[PDB]
Amino acid sequence: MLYVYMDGEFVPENEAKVSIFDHGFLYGDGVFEGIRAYNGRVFRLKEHIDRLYDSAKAIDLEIPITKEEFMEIILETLRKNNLRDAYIRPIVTRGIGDLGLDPRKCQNPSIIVITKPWGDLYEKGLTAITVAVRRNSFDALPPNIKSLNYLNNILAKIEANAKGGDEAIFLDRNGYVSEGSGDNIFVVKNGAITTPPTINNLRGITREAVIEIINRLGIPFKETNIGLYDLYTADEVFVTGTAAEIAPIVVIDGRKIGDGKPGEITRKLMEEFSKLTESEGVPIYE
Amino acid sequence: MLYVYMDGEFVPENEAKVSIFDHGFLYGDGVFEGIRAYNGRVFRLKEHIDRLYDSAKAIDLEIPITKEEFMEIILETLRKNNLRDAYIRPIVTRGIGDLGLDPRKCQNPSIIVITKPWGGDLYEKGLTAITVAVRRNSFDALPPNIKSLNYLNNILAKIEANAKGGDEAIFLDRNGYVSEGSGDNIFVVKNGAITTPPTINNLRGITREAVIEIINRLGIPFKETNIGLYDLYTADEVFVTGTAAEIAPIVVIDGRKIGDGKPGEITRKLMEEFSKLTESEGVPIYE
Amino acid sequence: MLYVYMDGEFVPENEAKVSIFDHGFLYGDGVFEGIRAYNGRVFRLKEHIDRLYDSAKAIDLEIPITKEEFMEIILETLRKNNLRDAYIRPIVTRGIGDLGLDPRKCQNPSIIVITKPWGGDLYEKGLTAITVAVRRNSFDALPPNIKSLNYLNNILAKIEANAKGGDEAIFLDRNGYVSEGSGDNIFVVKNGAITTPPTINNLRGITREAVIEIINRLGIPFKETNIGLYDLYTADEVFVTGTAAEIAPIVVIDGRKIGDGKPGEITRKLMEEFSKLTESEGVPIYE
Amino acid sequence: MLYVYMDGEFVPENEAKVSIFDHGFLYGDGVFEGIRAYNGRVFRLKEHIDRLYDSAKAIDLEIPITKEEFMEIILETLRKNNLRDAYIRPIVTRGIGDLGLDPRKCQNPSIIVITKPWGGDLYEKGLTAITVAVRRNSFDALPPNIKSLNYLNNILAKIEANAKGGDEAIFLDRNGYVSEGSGDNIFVVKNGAITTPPTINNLRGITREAVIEIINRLGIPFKETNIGLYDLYTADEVFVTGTAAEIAPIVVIDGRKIGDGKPGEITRKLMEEFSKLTESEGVPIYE
Amino acid sequence: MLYVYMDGEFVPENEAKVSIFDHGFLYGDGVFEGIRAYNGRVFRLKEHIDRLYDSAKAIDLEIPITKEEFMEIILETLRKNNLRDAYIRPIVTRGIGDLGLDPRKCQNPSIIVITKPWGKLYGDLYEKGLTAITVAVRRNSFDALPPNIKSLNYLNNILAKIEANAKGGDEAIFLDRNGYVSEGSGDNIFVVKNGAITTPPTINNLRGITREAVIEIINRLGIPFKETNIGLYDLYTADEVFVTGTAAEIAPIVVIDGRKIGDGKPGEITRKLMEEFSKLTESEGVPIYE
Amino acid sequence: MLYVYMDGEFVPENEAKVSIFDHGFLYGDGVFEGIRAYNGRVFRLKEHIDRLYDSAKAIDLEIPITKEEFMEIILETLRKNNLRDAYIRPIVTRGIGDLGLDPRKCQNPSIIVITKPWGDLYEKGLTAITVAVRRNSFDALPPNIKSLNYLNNILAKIEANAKGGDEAIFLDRNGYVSEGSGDNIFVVKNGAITTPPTINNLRGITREAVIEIINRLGIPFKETNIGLYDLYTADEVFVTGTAAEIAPIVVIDGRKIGDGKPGEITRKLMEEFSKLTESEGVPIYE
């Protein structure tokens, strides 16, 4: 039924498998992206591919095809599955080597493209908890790299699951707010919006699009460090990501945020973002 | 030719593959061990299996078989490949779920056992090391005590070592203390006394534990305490420990000769004692 | 129907009030203790009073009576209320001054002694704990070794625990190491050995000290060393210690069952030994 | 002579007392503000009340009256004492509960309003400051943005300043950056440009906000950015801002003369502009 | 042959010596500057002297002459050696005292001016670009030994240089105590990505005079510019990286930690800034002889 | 009147000068020791020389003579000045090179030996203040290296001078007590003695000798991290170093330590240390 691109061939989902000797599996030595197709268009495809190549460069991995080729493979995979509204997960691995860690002994990076169809939480908003684990440090395992090492994020999610939150919020190694387990975070206070600099989190493509909207609407905006206090006393909080789009956060660590309902600025940004996704993107067909 | 245990079946190496939808692959959401078989015996098998289950507990992953069953599967895999001297890599994954990170959506952890035959001139001369710019993953972020499939921090250090002329990389931690090598624990020898970092910022090495037993048996003064760059540079001897490496002497750090630049007397003594231990101890594969 | 000692007079509870201009109220500028009376004896009275004077010294506050006088006032207050089993809360404040924070403007520290009667289904089943996002007050900012009226750090942790399904909150410190619970010290049991953090990032608990004496008397291997999240999650047993709590088992941390999820054998043994200690030791209230 | 608002009644100063069982006293579990009345007007009353409610939200405390009601109570208290020039200290406490720290056991928060008359030579000459060894309470432990009854960190800094020859203490934060004074925000002037730390490691000062409005109106180059010890020592001018202090010049830091050792031209200009602002703005007390 | 100014006298290089009891030698208790003369002009002389006095103020050292006097001494030293293109190193020491560290026991700070000829024997010395490595040692903290002070305490920088020498880099790059990029062992660092330029704030490094001049050029050219914290990731994934300093001018960095930066050659924006900076040095400065 | 050893010759003090082009002067690129001669004996000469060579190794500086030769030069310098009670300051510099920082360009390290004669505050004790500056980090400029870079120590001393302390006390980059500006620190509480581990400070030779005495006397002793709280609430505090020997600290940050007078354990250790200095050491003459 659904086909996965894997190293030059289309392979059914149930058969899409990688060698256990690939360093992408043994050590999470690889990179990935998350991309959305809306109404036959791929939203910000080029931006995602640029980021995929930056992630690879950061881990000294050479992607064995060009950006143009990678974009064509993504479009082809969507076509092959006849999708118009989808989630796309391109993955590049280090490849098979010996059982040590040396990446120089790895040959043939694998290229994989997964496409899956995409068809109360936003009306009511999400509950969040701040986690005890800090985000992976920008001087240890830089979170700006979207790699197959996502266990830091998973530990945060496990905490949220056990602690009554829909979402986990990280602080960084220096005590500053970082991001959610899988999304960037924005704070609204007295009509002005703040978001952390991207060094301790990930340069979100949704985040970038939302900042463009914010500036277009003339809402006062500042990229600056935020703390627990700013989260708790905010008028509104929301998170941004490819899968989530814009999700309101209405409770943090048992405290109602503002009136406890998705806020007016958040709702306005949600509308504007929907508009953007309906009118922009690389066409899949024709 | 060589068979891998994978979820109840023996599968040839070239066919040993995991679903790309397993969270072990998508997110490195899984745990592993490294174990050695010497002369038909598996060295410290129980200790490694205890640590595998601790790694799983740390990431809230339930291993779907008992420790006894896991040990039998390891022995069976070695038997199936007729090995007497081998490296063993058991792996447990979170399993297949959807494309989000939530582990609650994953069912059926995979159980995998890799066994590869095993049979140094670098040990006569010793290794060169460099200290890396990247710090070790924090014990309050992604605890390095967990032996997980998230090894990119270690790989980044190895990439630095490759580019900077070192056979091995040495990490400092988030607080500026010496941690470990990219894949081994680290020991410093100075004026007849040995120091090693506490295990919080690194990994509770089974080789490290065995070497400490030897050290205490020999009556060499020993202290588990924080060490710094200064202690590395001014050491009489430095060595690293791990399953694959055993005991490897480090004779140059950041361009500085360690002592006389040759593997030291205490290191050599510990290397001999450790060889003896591996030849006389372990769970028998065949008898 | 209970009397409180307040600056030389015995005052009924409903009338026990402090000026809003006391810096102890305006700024939490004061120190306190928590002490238990068991069967007509005050457990470790002298140790608690020594710590009260150390807390005061740390904040440069001069307690205007001697330790001997303070002990007599505590005994008198218990007598006046005819208590044999009680919780005692001595408090010393900076005193009344102007509306600035300068302690030089404050003249007459207040001395207060509260005694309340004391007469554990959660101890059969054990407590659930969650690790909090807030770190403990730093030992280079507002040292937690000072038992002061500044307890908002502890309250924020408790608020997190209340919202996040834990009976107790566990803090990490400014450097990523485990510190303590919101109101108790923490111990980890693993393979028959016990570890607890050094006291610098937490509080030199009198219960903690008594439990360490028991541990050493029983010959259980014991080490004071830094502990991390990993050590909590993979422990055989965890327990917390304090005056009010005594020894409380922790059986779930951050959704993970600790060992078998029931109070452990070593914990239960220490609980018994500690009960024995409280029944046979202490400064007698009567005669 | 002077009356304090306390839970619905006016009470003379000498009788204004709080139960020792209020958590505001036992644990400093409460919030406060500092507000000035100038010539029958309350300067930035609404801003202070907004911040009071934000402080309460941060510690999960529900103030049991509306902001409008709180403002009326403040005006009423000033009227009752016939004040035109005053310092106002509203306080909200967690309330009486049991002797544990759990705020869920507390029922009835207390509402308190203190008003004291107000109405120099240190401002012509400027103040001496010393940087303290204690760091400011961390924004990830006990956020300094909360104006709470936990002021012992500030008091420790003041004690250091008293012992070390400074009129004021200057804090660095947990990451080594300049934070603020023990009771005021800090600004640096260098080559005609002004810098001040971001507010995360200190307090969002209402005076600070008013001074930034003046700075921007005057077109003085201004940047909110991290400052270090070096920037303090080599500044042309330094000043601090707060409700009680207004704008105070700092002319010596750690034994070093700042610029020429006298209040600087930009500081003096800002002092004039700020006086003007206080004379022409505010919520009228009478009529 | 070359004369050094030392406390009021001109002294030949081979005789230019300081008492071993000067605290500047015993403890590195002193301050210095690095200044260039181009075609008979001293580039940004006043800015360098202002920074020298700020360094001294930071270590509570009173320079015993005025800024105007110091500038005249520098010009005089260049004249005495008949230089038109030179490197200038003014130094002020704490002075001679006893063998303890207390600076109160020191009298008479020494004033020293070194001038050495400078000849770019080839233009296009940075045609290929430099290789860099990030070091394990962090930069001296802004709350311990502030790097904004250009003092005689340069051992942190030397340790980084030793690492670079042993690890195959022409230059060392520091991170700071909080994990942020700081600077090179002797130069400020800039990152170019998608036509925009970033550089760290100056708190964890040094307020470079070259850095300041390059920022003026950047703004004049209308290149998007932001002063903000940068991490290892930003270095590795940059289109271009360059470093700035008095001696180096603008030096391209084309490899970091074994990774080619962009195409591995000095980048277009870097080359443009190098041209503009050369122009600036040819047309500005305090005249030595005029 | 007094002669300084400088690169093979004895040179009068007033003429003892180093080239301004030596990197030891330009960049503080060199190492030093502090040693005492008592009654014609040099106390712990070998330990000091071992530490000098360790400092040099730490900065990758090769001392161009052997330890035995260095010891002889020290003895010779003392003899030449006819001293019996003295302070000795050996110094090794990187040497002359060009004006850059690269140590590869420096060829001939200088060897210098300074010897100066040696002969109420200990009866009353010293006042100390804790400084705002942290000690140089063990991951930046390791304080275990006794180098010519002493400006961190000088900044602390400047703070102490301005803030009414005879001595400055440092905390480290992680908030733990480190040492004084020129001495190690010990805390006495309820008959037991604590001192920080040596990683964040310097492996003091006096400190080592005092620990030997402590153990010989059977006083309970522990090497562990100490905080501000432990300083303020101590029964006794003292500092140790070559010049200071054992100095009691009786006031810290305006707080009287115990009764404000040198304590019983401190006084006992001062006596025992005097005894040690009278009966041990390498003889200068014969």
Ligand SMILES: Cc1ncc(COP(=O)(O)O)c(CNc2cccc(C(=O)O)c2)c1O
């Ligand atoms: C980070 C780390 N530290 C220490 C050890 C040593 O532990 P044992 O003494 O128990 O083996 C390990 C485990 N050693 C390990 C794991 C994976 C790869 C490699 C390699 O050398 O390439 C080494 C490890 O992965």
Ligand SMILES: Cc1ncc(COP(=O)(O)O)c(CNc2cccc(C(=O)O)c2)c1O
């Ligand atoms: C850590 C992190 N932060 C931010 C984002 C948002 O980036 P974009 O705006 O470019 O998508 C991501 C990406 N979002 C992401 C990726 C993988 C899984 C999940 C999940 O919700 O389970 C979320 C991410 O993984």
Ligand SMILES: Cc1ncc(COP(=O)(O)O)c(CNc2cccc(C(=O)O)c2)c1O
């Ligand atoms: C830590 C702190 N920082 C800044 C300010 C200034 O904020 P406003 O500009 O909003 O006033 C304050 C408030 N100022 C304050 C509060 C309580 C006591 C004292 C005192 O100086 O004794 C001072 C404060 O307590």
Ligand SMILES: Cc1ncc(COP(=O)(O)O)c(CNc2cccc(C(=O)O)c2)c1O
């Ligand atoms: C930073 C530091 N720490 C400890 C000591 C004590 O070490 P020994 O016990 O090995 O001497 C020292 C050495 N003490 C020293 C050196 C130079 C000057 C001054 C001064 O107080 O003016 C003091 C030192 O400089």
Ligand SMILES: Cc1ncc(COP(=O)(O)O)c(CNc2cccc(C(=O)O)c2)c1O
């Ligand atoms: C640490 C540091 N950072 C930046 C600069 C650049 O500042 P100007 O742009 O103002 O020059 C310097 C100064 N550059 C400097 C000083 C001394 C030696 C060396 C060397 O590279 O060998 C370099 C420096 O020493």
Ligand SMILES: [Cl-]
């Ligand atoms: Cl990390």
Ligand SMILES: [Cl-]
């Ligand atoms: Cl900030």
Ligand SMILES: [Cl-]
């Ligand atoms: Cl340590």
Ligand SMILES: [Cl-]
């Ligand atoms: Cl803190």
Ligand SMILES: [Cl-]
């Ligand atoms: Cl530790």
Ligand SMILES: [Cl-]
């Ligand atoms: Cl900054």
Ligand SMILES: [Cl-]
């Ligand atoms: Cl530092």
Ligand SMILES: [Cl-]
């Ligand atoms: Cl930042």
Ligand SMILES: [Cl-]
């Ligand atoms: Cl510790």
